[PDB]
Ligand binder design. Structure first.
Ligand SMILES: CCn1ccc2c(N3CCCC3=O)cc(C(=O)N[C@@H](Cc3ccccc3)[C@H](O)CNCc3cccc(OC)c3)cc21
Length: 372
């Protein structure tokens, strides 16, 4: 009953329905594996269709402490409190959880997005103000019998968040696991990057400077500057049969083709190799251009299909965002400190190429690829 419990708009995150307070107030909450605070709009905002009204909840408790959270995109400030929370299309339980009531924000809420809050699914180590603010999923596991694991199938868009287990109907083929290196973000280690089979030929620590994370709340694949520059050079080379403005590669400009004529075949597949659970072993996930060229829906331009380049540069490490996760079934196996990847039931492919998760591969270079 948790299948298809996610909705969203392309480029604007995926959200699940939740209720907060007594009596229950229904809100749509963005699912974010890249942070650890549960926060909801709690005052009027031009982009909010509704918001949390603390005065109407008999179970609300004020913690008398403010909190400020700046993300890569957007920021908000609010008041900490606790209240009862449920997930209508998830496990049928009610938990008391920490909630940040957002009273002020900047470039956080999105015009027309349909969500009103955010559910940080990562570890307490990156919770604000500090790690004593227990994250939602931690409270869920401690207060119920839900297994310490969840999975995401991200596919107007939709998908599934399966709390407490793995749904086999949501993937095909084998599940490959990579270790969670450190429990703060969902940090992983990339050991190799290929563009159309060609190795970027870089010290593998560069791929993980200064960390690499799996983040459902970020749209793009974000790469460390040095890796980004090398990747763009190789994607340009592969696609050189057409020449695009430098602004396209910087994600500042759309590229458009007559409806139905997008030249998918001139763009390369990107393979990211992730550390396996065994010494010097890895597996790879392969991303097609249908993933990293993000469609931008706009009726004004609808004579064409137009796209934004959804790989961009980072000064804070690699972020495997929604563009990478889409078309894969991703298991956040907290209990066993590992992340699993499999090909999703809602996968990308044309008649020539298919996204894949495959292995094992072996590396002769014994260098640890973790940056720290
Ligand atoms: C879905 C909306 N959206 C669209 C683009 C886009 C985007 N960017 C910017 C450039 C390329 C790219 O993809 C970045 C973010 C982003 O910052 N996401 C947040 C959640 C969020 C969701 C919705 C709105 C605002 C924030 C996430 O916690 C970040 N994790 C690591 C992170 C970074 C910094 C602090 C931190 O604290 C926990 C966590 C959201 C984006």
């Amino acid at each position: 009953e948790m299948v298809d419990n996610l909705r969203g708009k392309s480029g604007q995150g995926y959200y699940v329905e939740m209720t907060v307070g007594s009596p229950p107030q229904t809100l749509n909450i963005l699912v974010d594996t890249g942070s650890s605070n549960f926060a909801v709009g709690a005052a009027p905002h031009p982009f909010l269709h509704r918001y949390y009204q603390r005065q109407l909840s008999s179970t609300y408790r004020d913690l008398r402490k403010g909190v400020y959270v700046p993300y890569t995109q957007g920021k908000w400030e609010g008041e900490l409190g606790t209240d009862l929370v449920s997930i209508p299309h998830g496990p049928q339980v009610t938990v008391r959880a920490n909630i940040a009531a957002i009273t002020e924000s900047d470039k956080f809420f999105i015009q027309g997005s349909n969500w009103e809050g955010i559910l940080g699914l990562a570890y307490a180590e990156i919770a604000r103000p500090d790690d004593s603010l227990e994250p939602f999923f931690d409270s869920l596991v401690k207060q119920t019998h839900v297994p310490n694991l969840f999975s995401l199938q991200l596919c107007s868009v939709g998908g599934s968040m399966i709390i407490g287990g793995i749904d086999h109907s949501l993937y095909t083929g084998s599940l490959w696991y990579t270790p969670i290196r450190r429990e703060w973000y969902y940090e992983v280690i990339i050991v190799r990057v290929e563009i159309n089979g060609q190795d970027l030929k870089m010290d593998c620590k560069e791929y993980n400077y200064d960390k690499s994370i799996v983040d459902s709340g970020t749209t793009n694949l974000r790469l460390p500057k040095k890796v980004f520059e090398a990747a763009v050079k190789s994607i340009k080379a592969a696609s050189s049969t057409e020449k695009f403005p430098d602004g396209f590669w910087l994600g500042e400009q759309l590229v458009c083709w007559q409806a139905g004529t997008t030249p998918w075949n001139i763009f390369p597949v990107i393979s990211l190799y992730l550390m396996g659970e065994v010494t010097q072993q890895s597996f790879r996930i392969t991303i097609l251009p249908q993933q990293y060229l993000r469609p931008v829906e706009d009726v004004a331009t609808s004579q064409d299909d137009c796209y934004k380049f959804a790989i961009s540069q980072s000064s804070t490490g690699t972020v495997m965002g929604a563009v990478i996760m889409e078309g894969f079934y991703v298991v956040f196996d907290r209990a066993r400190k590992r992340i699993g990847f499999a090909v999703s039931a809602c996968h990308v492919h044309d008649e020539f190429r298919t996204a894949a998760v495959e292995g094992p591969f072996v590396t002769l270079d014994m260098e640890d690829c973790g940056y720290n």
